[PDB]
Design a protein around this ligand. Sequence first.
Ligand SMILES: [Zn+2]
Ligand SMILES: [Zn+2]
Lengths: 368, 177, 304, 47, 131, 204, 68, 97, 63, 14
Amino acid sequence: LEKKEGLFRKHMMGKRVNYAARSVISPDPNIETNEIGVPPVFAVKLTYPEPVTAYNIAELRQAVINGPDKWPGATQIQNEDGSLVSLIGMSVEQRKALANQLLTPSSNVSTHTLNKKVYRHIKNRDVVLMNRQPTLHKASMMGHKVRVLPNEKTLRLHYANTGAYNAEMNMHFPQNENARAEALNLANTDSQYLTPTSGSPVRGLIQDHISAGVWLTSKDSFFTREQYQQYIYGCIRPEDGHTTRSKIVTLPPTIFKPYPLWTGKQIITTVLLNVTPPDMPGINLISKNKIKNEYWGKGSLENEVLFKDGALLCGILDKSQYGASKYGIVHSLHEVYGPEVAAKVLSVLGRLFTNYITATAFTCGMDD
Amino acid sequence: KQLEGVHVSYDNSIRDADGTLVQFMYGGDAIDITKESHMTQFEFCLDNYYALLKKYNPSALIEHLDVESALKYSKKTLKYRKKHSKEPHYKQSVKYDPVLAKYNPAKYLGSVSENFQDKLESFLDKNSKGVNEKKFRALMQLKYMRSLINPGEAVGIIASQSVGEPSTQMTLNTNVT
Amino acid sequence: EWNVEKFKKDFEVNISSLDAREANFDLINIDTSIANAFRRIMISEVPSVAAEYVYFFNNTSVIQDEVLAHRIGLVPLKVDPDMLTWVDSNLPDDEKFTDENTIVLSLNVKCTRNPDAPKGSTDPKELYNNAHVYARDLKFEPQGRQSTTFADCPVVPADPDILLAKLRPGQEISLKAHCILGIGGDHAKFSPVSTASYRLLPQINILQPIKGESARRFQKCFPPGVIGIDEGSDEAYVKDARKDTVSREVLRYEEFADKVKLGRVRNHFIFNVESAGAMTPEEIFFKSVRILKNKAEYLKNCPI
Amino acid sequence: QGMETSTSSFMKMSYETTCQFLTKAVSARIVVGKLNNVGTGSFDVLA
Amino acid sequence: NTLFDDIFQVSEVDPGRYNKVCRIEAASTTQDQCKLTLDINVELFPVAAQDSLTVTIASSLNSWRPPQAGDRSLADDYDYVMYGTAYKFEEVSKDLIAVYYSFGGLLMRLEGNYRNLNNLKQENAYLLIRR
Amino acid sequence: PHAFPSRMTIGMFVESLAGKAGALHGIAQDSTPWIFNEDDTPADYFGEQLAKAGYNYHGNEPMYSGATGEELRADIYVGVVYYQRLRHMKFQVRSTGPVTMQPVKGRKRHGGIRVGEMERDALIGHGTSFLLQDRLLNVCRECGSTQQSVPRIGSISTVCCRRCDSQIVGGNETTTVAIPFVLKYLDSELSAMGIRLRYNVEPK
Amino acid sequence: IVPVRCFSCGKVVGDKWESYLNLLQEDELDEGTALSRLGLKRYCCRRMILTHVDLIEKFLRYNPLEKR
Amino acid sequence: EKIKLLTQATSEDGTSASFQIVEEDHTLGNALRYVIMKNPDVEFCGYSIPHPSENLLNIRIQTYGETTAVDALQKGLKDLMDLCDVVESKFTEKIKS
Amino acid sequence: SILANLTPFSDFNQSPRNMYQCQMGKQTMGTPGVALCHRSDNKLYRLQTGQTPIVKANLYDDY
Amino acid sequence: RKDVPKVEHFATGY
Ligand SMILES: [Zn+2]
Ligand SMILES: [Zn+2]
């Protein structure tokens, strides 16, 4: 009840919380933009109280067997009310023949509705909140899906979120399905592609991928059938649900004789063709990039990009086209197909430029 | 702390928990500041027309709304405005209110802001044409209806953040404060 | 229609500088995919032996126990990998080790000043006995069948002259190691190869006829054993491509910028394989290719 | 100077000068733990 | 089937900060108005200035597959074949219409007259070049 | 390489160049400010040494990728530089444990993390009401402002609120409600403060 | 504290510290020729012998088990 | 086991499928992709890695029909087996010289 | 300053970066000394190895 | 001013 350290601004307008964690951030392009890097130490630590139904009995009948030992597991059970039978001080044999019968027969009718509940380790499907102080704007806090990496202990986020978080940070893990739905549908990063300050986008690839795009989409790029197919598959990975076509589709080579060849712009075109949902026309777009034509010599019209029915035909990508800029190609793709498709496109571009830059690296030297 | 409670009502006005109104509209347009980047991007909207038509599924958006009344009111209002857009601010009367005040902008099609109508007409007055203007206007108005703030937003909180957070990097150094 | 027979007909090898320590063979008419696969298999997958699971009975030296253990682990041994067996790693420690799956080393050195020391001497050897600890101080006390098997194969460090630690009077070290088979990827200590890289054969495409003293200065830019001078017409020409490191020194000079394009052939890999004393480069290369074959066969045989 | 006329005094108390405003009384959903009235709380559900 | 054919006297070739592709200042010999601008990679098809080359635009060659045994096409009769679509039609002046083609970034600008360029239309159009 | 255009540290490049030259020739390279005039550019000075050593004049050493095994597009700028390790080596996590009944403060004390006022504002700004409730959480019926739960012999626990056998004299109107436990501390502090308000307890 | 194994490449150089010292001191040479005769070609190896502060001599004479 | 097929992205006829391999990396992936793409029957072939920390390799094969992608796999490995077998004999001979 | 002179080619960097280097050097995992056998203290942060700078500034040895 | 005084690599297998 004091000026600035009073009971209000210290225990009523803000509190310490349970089921939360804090660490430092290690960027990782190899994860989906709506996902986060959860070390296995957190996985055995953070648990979620989830009741046992008649459809997910086995999925938890083995999580109890795992226990705190191996992820995914079960820290403890919540038999009836309270009675938190712990599993840390339990043998594997003890957990066997005991946690097998989670759906016990009718014992008593005093509480005949709440069957049973089992705390379980955090799995990939879940969602957590991420906050980086100072939380200057609401965009500084979002939600992300779980990606349990059996690797070293630090948090991993995609490079796109750097523009939003302005990037160590904290993690919040709710236990109620209402909060789960709120995070996954209202607080999820994909739903927040734009900022209410001026309506401009804030999320996109930043520096390495920008340079990679500039080098790849230039007219001086050509790829054989092997390279083209490899880039497309590595960028897409349809088996992870990226595309619903259930079979990747390619494009005719831009050159047949003397031998087949493709082009980086054609790579972008087939990327869009794969990610764009079927039964839908392609994107038509006209805009300009940040590079003047004269930087490519006479007779070049590369300053202006010209999409047509979901196919790049002129110009090159840039920070303006993709990244964090208004009226860009990614911005228009958002406008047309919703935010989810734009987020998937950004993730696919991040994966592509990463794989491409490994094949031909980018470097600055004293000669420059 | 001052605006922790102000939120968008189910009605177009903005009311706190007590219900006191701050403003009947949201800036006079009721358009969500997020889903409004390409409201005036008429060329891009015209392109990918079929994609936009598929995303704003018009087959399902006819059994729960009507258009003709609001459209007629808007036509009369624009006609009168164009008739008397020359005389000064203090000599003008109010023969007809702007459409948003008259009708629920989110339930009656064609219920759009004044400047939106002016810019849409200015763009459509360019010839060069699927390309039917009678359906292009319908799609644009459907998008405008779909670009409205949901009841229950944290506007006010959003306004405070949009004023404060950008001010951190607003100015450092070099008469008026 | 590419085929195994076509590959066999086109493929050829050129061993250049085979040695008991280093190899410099060439690969011709093969794809960068297979070349890099061999490179990676040699560097990482090829099994080898190095010390780990070190047990300390006593140590008081300046060098810490962890540092000393790591230093000992980073030692090249001599026993061939194909004399030892892997460890299940999910066994009790007594059952974790047998005669044929590990070897044992002991150090147990003690240092004390020798009174007989020349006046005004700073050499640690003269000032104190056991002043320095070397690799050769490591013994290989065998167990069971190891005594019979290693009769002609005494387990000695591949480099007995390395300096494990320095001591002082009243300073003693006593430990006990346990070397096992390595897989390289687990830890660089299990690296049978110092480096197994390769370089593509440089290609020099001379366009203009380079003649006169201007040809001589062109000769100067490259390493001496690369460019040749045609005595018949005072013409510069390529004598040995392998002799050239990719220097691009000519590109600096404006006169020769248009006269030559510094290309590089794409099916001529100049392999260069150093090694530790465990195995010869030829043996490790054969191990690598057989490992790749075993990988392919296992992948084929395991059902889906 | 502006917080005075606000009806609910819990916000005034949470703001500066928690003392004077408490006397005149003789965010709130946060204080009592009541479900908020914005977003998913700006309405109710049943059935 | 073919839709356009002529021989162009390449006036000038310029790479322009490009390692592979180069601008082509093509110009038809028969017509006094047909002019062509194109960029192709000289690595797979070297081109010099003051040269005459065969240019033909085809609607097909008689889903894509690498070539097999017993395959025939206009590509076989030609030398260097590119595939792409047109994107822009312009009325330069009376009896002067320019057609813009793009081949995976490699843009082609073709200029002429209605009666000769009438066959051209916005669709996929193989471009075939022979020495 | 993208660090340099913003950072603008040409010293890193010059150190790499001179470090390669020194590591090759065996000599030690001196880096003293104001010894290289523009006519004595250190780039040229170390390039001469690298050329005489037989390496790339600009330090661009050709390299091959480690995954594909193919040559990279351009020669990589590689050299030797001096690198220092810092002591800033942090992670914290809790589920239950130490605890106004709020969790204790401190990484080393198994504490939690405070959800600040700006964090609460961000919770509101998204409109995620249940999320705010879970991040900030998870009574006398007649008086409406406690005292209960004193079973006597074998009866269940009842209420005997003095502010209010069966109801002795106290009252028998009190049922469980969900509230933060900072509220009881606030109530007691106000009771000592001598201030009470008509806390309108909602009905069943 | 001579690095036993080359950090970058992996060529063993621990044995070569004493030899380097002898070649530098007993016979009059320079560091480049000393490393050449010692048998180091790549600078990834040449580092750990050209620059290695022998902080065992200074660090060692503070023995606690011997009278000063 | 070490190799598995992804029924999520498989085709009904089996002409297109994707496989997941454990304990592999670019080393095996690039070589196997090369060998499989040597076969003219397959239409699409490529390898992918879920995440570098995980030692998992994902390979997808899309034939031109008439051949099960499973058969195209074992066809490639057998060719790979011979491909890494010809070098041994070729390398051994040069040792003799 | 002494530490400022220890920075190689300070005349080619940006002054904020020079200041960052000066502040960072005092945060290093340093070599506290050699008497660490008996220097009982709260924290030392001893780096096990270490090498002279191949590009060492002059006066690095003079100090 | 006097300039900084001057000072007065094989392929694999060579
Ligand atoms: Zn009461
Ligand atoms: Zn080395």
